[PDB]
Design a protein around this ligand. Structure first.
Ligand SMILES: *[C@@H]1O[C@H](CO)[C@@H](O[C@@H]2O[C@H](CO)[C@@H](O[C@@H]3O[C@H](CO)[C@@H](O)[C@H](O)[C@@H]3O)[C@H](O)[C@H]2NC(C)=O)[C@H](O)[C@H]1NC(C)=O
Ligand SMILES: *[C@@H]1O[C@H](CO)[C@@H](O[C@@H]2O[C@H](CO)[C@@H](O[C@@H]3O[C@H](CO)[C@@H](O)[C@H](O)[C@@H]3O)[C@H](O)[C@H]2NC(C)=O)[C@H](O)[C@H]1NC(C)=O
Ligand SMILES: *[C@@H]1O[C@H](CO)[C@@H](O[C@@H]2O[C@H](CO)[C@@H](O[C@@H]3O[C@H](CO)[C@@H](O)[C@H](O)[C@@H]3O)[C@H](O)[C@H]2NC(C)=O)[C@H](O)[C@H]1NC(C)=O
Ligand SMILES: *[C@@H]1O[C@H](CO)[C@@H](O[C@@H]2O[C@H](CO)[C@@H](O[C@@H]3O[C@H](CO)[C@@H](O)[C@H](O)[C@@H]3O)[C@H](O)[C@H]2NC(C)=O)[C@H](O)[C@H]1NC(C)=O
Lengths: 438, 52, 438
């Protein structure tokens, strides 16, 4: 038997679906979302880490000159300084008084730990939602891992389940992303081959193990001071270390809809938005023949107490009379009130009690025990507590019933004014018809 | 602030904590008509005035 | 000096760009696309292959009954049959005349070479373009590997290029793809866990190494024939084998725009569609000061021969007079005609010959040598060969010049009719004015 429903994408909300097959007693099965995960598809642009400047010993040629030789090294700098006269601890070498020369070289490289401490720059698109759902009905109670798209069918107790695509296409990750350790930054980074000194990305590499490197750190050589050997230089400090101090916030602490950002792999979890369509295919052994199901007549519903709090703050009593003792399946045909359970024990004594949660001043909903029906209406009082550590068990429906006190009063007033208008219309009609008849 | 959607605070190394607000107000429903308006003004205090 | 232009996305086309700096002599860059590859992003859905039915030896109990034991195997089947009297080569065992049983068992498994011969079901989206571009100006070639999006800057001889995003967002891949060895098929496969017997995907596995397997092959058992031990069964033949001979065409033999489909990684090669913007940032060493460039004055253009064919079928002779001899940058300022070469060796004799290709009956285009300009008009005759083995070397512009023979005839005839109309209007105005003045 095929059935289709829609359940809210809320973790911990007890969804209950009511199946009413023509030949069998009604069935109520409970579905709950234990967990959720939403992962974008990432393709790596480059990585960044702190650099390291390589400065070899200067070549001081005495009594002669040297020539600078170009090399294919990242941000390579080389210059030749003439007229040097260095000293060392024992004396001054370069016997020639002023026909000497020094060669200074410097380049940059990735730091020795770039495979341990680095940041990845990604582009994110087309997230896929996975879920973990517990389904329970009859003697079946079991939890499954599913892909939330119309392209994954699972079997639970012989029943086939397909959890269709999510209602909305909202994702918290925008086009460009930067990942550092276990923190995701919702950032726009410079293109590859176009990094700037002192900012994020002043050195860029396609992969951790890649061999070529791009570097732009404004490294510049300077003339050595007279009488000493040292190779001076100036270089703008690392842009990775500057990002580490001026990165700003994170997506972990900003994300809407209250969802946790995890890394490795990058994902957003328990992120309450949208609805999940569900398609079902049940066997005939899930139901019960309407013969051995109990027969209930004269179903009366009276509300004992009500207070529209987050938990199950209303109590409900049903009176009936039955021919045989057995089990029935209760259900509330409105989302104004959410019931605690999906099954009751019927006995010849004729009294069952059950708990419901609502959020409106005066609810009115129809409840059904096996095949019977009844209408329940109540007047509920506000709670006194201001703040609670748990989420609502209701659907946040507030608009009151037409028989409730507020709308009853409005109905009385509007009816009085309408009667006044109708009477005046009749008076004018009679007078104008008399005027016409003359 | 703690709206009805909830709020989350993280303080130190220990785990973040969530809090939700209830639909609490100061009037009394099912009372005189000048108290029902107070009830519906305590919560949603911007469409009640327009509707009235 | 930053400059910006656009290129056709056709392989082998000789694009020529003209840069005209106010303080310098003009420059001409030549760019070609040597190769492209359009890469989709894939999500593996599952793996399909031929199955293997495993059937253990049967169990026969003499004066006993065997109780059927269930277990968790893919598409597992077990039965017990009563009253067997098997015979073997030496005779019939089971003294027990009738009250003895046989237990039959069978299940499905992934085949021994599924690691080597399988088909993969993918979801494809968000393709990325990558190219090899040959850039030449002054005295260098080079070919560079570029990601064709606005986020890759590559330096050639001191000039850095960004090849902008392709104008179109066209891809030859649908949402769902099936890859087999070296072929790609645009095909909708069944959802995982919902494959049907005898068709593609009767057995599904989430990955080659995955331990779990879905099998729906309609395996059934039957009673053994009397006096015999053989475990019969009937079971629908494989769906991977069935698909292999009934898949139908491919995408390799079908794709629009003439692009080659290749695999691992799956990509579309040389797939001529759209336009690509390019932005450059040239140094000052690229240009030549206007003082060094020869001064060209009194420039005229005359065409010797035309044939608006695919290759370079038009010849152009160009006259001038110069004060020194050197190099000029020639350019054709309309896409109605395409010049073969980018620089001309200017001498004091006063003649340069240029080769151009067009597809219009009467081209008209302005050409510049160094800094001079001239307008070239030609009357070109159609080819004789019907079919050629090379692509067109023009831009397929056909509308003639307004001074061509056909448009000249149209212009004369329309002018005559307009003169008749103007005379009619004037005479009517004159007569009406005379009558009104009465
Ligand atoms: C021992 O010390 C003497 C002290 O001068 C060194 O003599 C110097 O030797 C170099 C050899 O490279 C001479 O350089 C050459 O000088 C000429 C003329 O200036 C120049 O045109 C060449 O290009 C080259 O650089 C240098 O002039 C000379 N000094 C003098 C003659 O006063 C000698 O080399 C030392 N012996 C060693 C290091 O084995
Ligand atoms: C349907 O099946 C699930 C399990 O598949 C049942 O979950 C059960 O939940 C209860 C509490 O809701 C768990 O009991 C708890 O055990 C911890 C152990 O430290 C104890 O500290 C708690 O005070 C509480 O007693 C129970 O272990 C868990 N069952 C499992 C994990 O197998 C669920 O209750 C079932 N539904 C129904 C209606 O029975
Ligand atoms: C040697 O061969 C003899 C056959 O002549 C086997 O004896 C047979 O054993 C089975 C099982 O004990 C007997 O089945 C039983 O039947 C009675 C009804 O009389 C029933 O109450 C039991 O529950 C069971 O079904 C079978 O009757 C019996 N055959 C005869 C003729 O009595 C014997 O088992 C063989 N020995 C070995 C070691 O296999
Ligand atoms: C730009 O630089 C490239 C780098 O070499 C040049 O490519 C090569 O050009 C030579 C011609 O000098 C080609 O060799 C010839 O190829 C023809 C093809 O039919 C063959 O018949 C000849 O025997 C000879 O081998 C060579 O194939 C070509 N290489 C590639 C990869 O295209 C190019 O010529 C330079 N362009 C200019 C305008 O300077």
């Amino acid at each position: 038997y095929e059935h289709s429903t829609v359940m809210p994408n809320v973790v911990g909300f007890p969804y209950k679906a009511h199946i009413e097959r023509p030949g069998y007693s009604p069935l109520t099965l409970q579905m709950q979302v234990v967990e959720t995960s939403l992962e974008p598809t990432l393709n790596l642009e480059y990585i960044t880490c702190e650099y390291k400047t390589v400065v070899p010993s200067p070549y001081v040629k005495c009594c002669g000159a040297s020539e600078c030789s170009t090399k294919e090294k990242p941000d390579y700098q080389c210059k030749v300084y003439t007229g040097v006269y260095p000293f060392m601890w024992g004396g001054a070498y370069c016997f020639c008084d002023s026909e000497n020369t020094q060669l200074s070289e410097a380049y940059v490289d990735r730091s020795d730990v770039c495979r341990h401490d680095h940041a990845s720059a990604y582009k994110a698109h087309t997230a896929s939602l996975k879920a973990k759902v517990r389904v329970m009905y009859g003697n079946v109670n079991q939890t499954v891992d599913v892909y939330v798209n119309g392209d994954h069918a699972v079997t639970i107790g012989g029943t086939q389940f397909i959890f269709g695509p999510l209602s909305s296409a909202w994702t918290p990750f925008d086009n460009k992303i930067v990942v550092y350790k276990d923190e995701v930054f919702n950032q726009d980074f410079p293109p590859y081959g176009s990094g700037q000194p002192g900012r994020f990305g002043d050195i860029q590499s396609r992969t951790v193990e890649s061999n070529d490197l791009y570097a732009n750190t404004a490294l510049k050589l300077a003339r050595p001071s007279p009488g000493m050997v040292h190779v001076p230089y100036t270089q703008t400090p690392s842009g990775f270390k500057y990002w580490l101090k001026e990165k700003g916030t994170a997506l972990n602490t900003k994300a809407p809809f209250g969802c946790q950002i995890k890394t490795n792999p990058v994902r957003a979890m328990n992120c309450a938005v949208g609805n999940i369509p569900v398609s079902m295919n049940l066997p005939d052994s899930a139901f019960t023949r309407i013969v051995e199901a109990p027969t209930i007549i004269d179903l009366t519903c009276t509300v004992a107490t009500c207070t529209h709090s987050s938990d199950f703050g209303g109590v409900l009593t049903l009176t009936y009379k039955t021919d045989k003792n057995g089990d029935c399946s209760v259900h509330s045909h409105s989302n104004v009130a959410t019931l605690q359970e999906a099954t009751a024990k019927v006995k010849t004594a004729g009294k069952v009690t059950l708990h419901f949660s609502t959020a409106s001043a005066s609810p009115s909903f129809v409840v059904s025990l096996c095949s019977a029906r009844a209408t329940c209406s109540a007047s509920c009082e506000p709670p006194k507590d201001h703040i609670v550590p748990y989420a609502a068990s209701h659907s946040n429906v507030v608009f009151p019933d037409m028989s409730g006190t507020a709308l009853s009063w409005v109905q009385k007033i509007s009816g009085g004014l309408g009667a006044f208008a109708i009477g005046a219309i009749l008076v004018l009609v009679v007078v104008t018809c008399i005027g016409l008849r003359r | 602030p703690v709206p009805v959607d909830g709020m989350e605070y993280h303080w130190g190394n220990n785990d973040p904590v969530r809090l939700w607000s209830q639909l609490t107000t100061e009037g009394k429903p099912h009372g005189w008509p000048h108290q029902i308006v107070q009830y519906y003004y305590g919560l949603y205090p911007a469409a009640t005035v327009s509707a009235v």
